[PDB]
Design a protein around this ligand. Structure first.
Ligand SMILES: CC(C)N(CCCNC(=O)Nc1ccc(C(C)(C)C)cc1)C[C@H]1O[C@@H](n2cnc3c(N)ncnc32)[C@H](O)[C@@H]1O
Length: 315
């Protein structure tokens, strides 16, 4: 049992990798996870970076990297017992670190098969959230978007619902791995829960109604599903928000007597700035749509109906 070990910068149990190092997929292996972990822990701790071309296929070369990191850590834990203040323990991971952490968790969780990551990141920055908010990802897969958002924001709670057996199972793991690795790096996340469920179900009806921020990746959703979703969103509170990959109402909705009951009567819809250098499987750059529950649109229309002048114009 030849092995490599990395010490936690905050004294959690060490990460232990068997030799020879496992490959995760055609683009990810333990070797580079190790290397990358070291680089990121160095970003967490400037002194560690100060204190610190490799052959990822030589055990001795890789052990010289680990020992060197591990000694630098010991040395840093000593420095903190002195007057130097330890790394503050309650912080959120930088975006960079979070990217690594999520890659790492994926690798250790999903054993059989994240440009989204960058998009989600853009959305986290545009969509201000606070401790008032409840976030849900509808059709949450293995959970990566809940985890990312839960790591980055103050929402009071974050949920993901997913109905298929496979992804839901991985999600149970992704949850354990995530908490484990976040403890390893000494970072906080907001509360979250990843659940099995169908978000079209009667329980979810009320839950959708009380959620203030919904992400849903509905591009390939069919008419029936998008329509059922519209009927769920109709019950949401003023200022509720939905971010999606396909808009649930037209962007220039003009309210009139034929379309009174359409969901565009009750929501502002905007196209969100795309991410430069993004390109979907289609070939077109990726755009995203923000809907904000705003029932003043319907109010003003009905006001207008009462005003004979404004009534004639329309008419
Ligand atoms: C492709 C989507 C939908 N989703 C998985 C995607 C993983 N999560 C995201 O990608 N979130 C996200 C990403 C980007 C944005 C932006 C901000 C718009 C860019 C917003 C949200 C399919 C999963 O839904 C389940 N699923 C499908 N239908 C249901 C259902 N009816 N009930 C429960 N789960 C369902 C399926 O079983 C499948 O497991």
């Amino acid at each position: 049992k030849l092995e490599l070990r990395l010490k936690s910068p905050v004294g959690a149990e060490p990460a232990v990798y068997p030799w020879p190092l496992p490959v995760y997929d055609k683009h990810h292996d333990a070797a580079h996870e190790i290397i990358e972990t070291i680089r990121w822990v160095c970003e967490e701790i400037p002194d560690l970076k100060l204190a610190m071309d490799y052959d990822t296929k030589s055990f001795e070369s890789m052990q010289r990297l680990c020992d060197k990191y591990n000694r630098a850590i010991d040395s840093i834990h000593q420095l903190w017992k002195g007057t130097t203040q330890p790394m503050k323990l309650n912080t959120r991971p930088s975006t960079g670190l979070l990217r690594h952490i999520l890659q790492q968790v994926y690798n250790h969780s999903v054993t059989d098969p994240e440009t989204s990551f960058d998009l989600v990141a853009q959305m986290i920055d545009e969509i201000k959230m606070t401790d008032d908010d409840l976030f849900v990802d509808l059709g949450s897969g293995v959970g990566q978007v809940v985890l990312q958002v839960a790591a980055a924001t103050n929402c009071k709670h974050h949920y993901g619902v997913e109905k298929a057996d496979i992804p839901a199972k991985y999600a149970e793991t992704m949850d354990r791995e995530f908490r484990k690795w976040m403890k390893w790096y000494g970072k906080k996340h907001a509360e979250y829960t990843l659940e099995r469920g169908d978000f079209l179900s009667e329980e979810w009806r009320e839950r959708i109604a009380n959620t203030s921020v919904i992400f849903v990746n509905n591009f390939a959703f069919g008419p029936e599903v998008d329509h059922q979703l519209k009927e769920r969103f109709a019950n949401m509170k003023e200022g509720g928000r939905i971010v999606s990959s396909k808009p649930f109402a037209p962007l220039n909705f003009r309210i009139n007597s034929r379309n009174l009951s359409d969901i565009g009567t009750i929501m502002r819809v905007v196209e969100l700035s795309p991410l430069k250098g993004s390109v979907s499987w289609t070939g077109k750059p990726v755009s995203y749509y923000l809907h904000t529950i705003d029932r003043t649109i319907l109010e003003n229309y009905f006001s207008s109906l009462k005003n004979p002048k404004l009534r004639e114009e329309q008419e």
